[PDB]
Amino acid sequence: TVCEPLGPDRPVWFPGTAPPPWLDGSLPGDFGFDPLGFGSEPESLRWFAQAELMHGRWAMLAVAGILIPEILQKWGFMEEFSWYTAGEREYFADPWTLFVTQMALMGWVEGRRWMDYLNPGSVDIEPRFPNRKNPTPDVGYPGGLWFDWGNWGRGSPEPVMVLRTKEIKNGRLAMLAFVGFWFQVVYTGQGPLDNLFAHLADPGHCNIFSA
């Protein structure tokens, strides 16, 4: 736990501006950007931090699942066609069965996680053979060799706050990427790589303003 208070250690998102006082910069990925001041009170602050982390991780997974199969279609062996139209793809089972199974299992898991949030340490999975003392928690970073078997979130590979900063920044970027992909498919009728190459060929004209 390292703090990033005002000064050179605090590169303000808006140069020449004093960041909101209740934005200390402890949470990695902070730059003093909350003009709406939603993080005014601490309970809301931590709640929004958890929401941000979850959104970032899910958005990373979603953008990977969009990107990789489409390029492996374009040039790779197997041809995974339009992902936006894969939502209605036909499988062995009906979409509602898939939906209810997803909801059951994810409700189980996310409910256990919800109780962990409301009551830290009271719902954890970390066995204890004798004489080896286990690690604690920092909710949002469960620890133990279930979700950190590489021993990366604790020390050695990088000071923690730096790696969490990497994570939150990449997650914000991935959120932008997902909303961009979706909005493009709303407007255009291709995948992300197709729009990409179309822009590469004609950067000067092949844009949103092409029509």
């Binding site: 001041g37 939603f38 005014s40 009170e41 809301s44």
Partner: protein, 42 residues
């Protein structure tokens, strides 16, 4: 922030949202069961 929460807990806005939700439920039921005169379940 908490001020806007206590403000949102003031009866006008709470009542408006509650009534909107109830009316939406009723109109959706009517959509999924047109003219619904009797109780043809038992």
């Amino acid at each position: 922030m908490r001020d806007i929460k206590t403000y949102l807990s003031v009866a006008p806005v709470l009542s408006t949202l509650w009534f909107g939700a109830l009316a939406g439920l009723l109109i959706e039921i009517n959509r999924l069961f047109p003219d619904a005169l009797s109780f043809p379940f038992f």
